[PDB]
From a paper:
The phosphotransfer activates VanR as a transcription factor, which initiates the expression of resistance genes. The VanS sensor kinase is organized into several structural domains, which include a periplasmic sensor domain flanked by two transmembrane helices, a membrane-proximal HAMP domain, a dimerization-and-histidine-phosphorylation (DHp) domain, and a catalytic ATP-binding (CA) domain. Here, we present X-ray crystal structures for the catalytic and ATP-binding (CA) domains of two VanS proteins, derived from vancomycin-resistant enterococci types A and C. Both proteins adopt the canonical Bergerat fold that has been observed for CA domains of other prokaryotic histidine kinases.
The crystal asymmetric unit contains one copy of the CA domain, and the cadmium ions mediate two of the three lattice contacts that connect different VanSA molecules within the crystal. The structure was refined separately against two different data sets, one of which was measured at low energy (7 keV) and used for phasing, whereas the other was collected at an energy more typically used for protein crystallography (13.5 keV). The structures obtained from the two different data sets are essentially identical, with a few minor differences in side-chain conformers, and have an RMSD in Cα positions of 0.14 Å (0.59 Å for all nonhydrogen atoms). In particular, helix α3 occupies very different positions in the two structures, being positioned much closer to the nucleotide-binding site in VanSA than in VanSC. Hence, it seems likely that the ATP lids of VanSA and VanSC can adopt a range of positions, and crystallization of these two proteins has selected for two different conformers.
Author numbering: 227 to 322, 340 to 375
The structure:
């Protein structure tokens, strides 16, 4: 009988990252309906998103935007972090203090999935969680 108000969880995280991001002229912007909700362990999910943003911040190019889009489509709530810059493909095949291994099991324990891709222009992290 619980739920996470996702937009506001993402906002709080973004605000914790603001000093680190502004120092390189970066900016995280959230695109999401504010009505959007999901089930799960709130403090565990916040750590998932924190770890991912930590990765986006580390591989994001100076003076660029980190987009965090979240939406409900069918049975899936998806949260997608996209940044300009690339993860070296050897660090990328290893990705599962930037290790997303715990993030992954948290999401997996939630019945969800994490996708990471990277070309050489931008990097995408995608979290999918079951919808209520």
């Amino acid at each position: 009988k619980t739920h996470i108000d996702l937009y506001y969880m993402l906002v709080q995280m973004t605000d914790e990252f603001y000093p680190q991001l502004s120092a390189h002229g970066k900016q995280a912007v959230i695109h999401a309906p504010e009505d959007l909700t999901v089930s799960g362990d709130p403090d565990k999910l916040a750590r998932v998103f924190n770890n991912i943003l930590k990765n986006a911040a580390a591989y994001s190019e100076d003076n660029s935007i980190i987009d965090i889009t979240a939406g409900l489509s069918g049975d899936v709530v998806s949260i997608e972090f996209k940044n300009t810059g690339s993860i070296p493909k050897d660090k990328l095949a290893a990705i599962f203090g930037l290790g997303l291994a715990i993030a992954k099991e948290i999401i997996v324990q939630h019945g969800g999935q994490i996708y990471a891709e990277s070309n050489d222009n931008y990097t995408t992290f995608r979290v999918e969680l079951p919808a209520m």
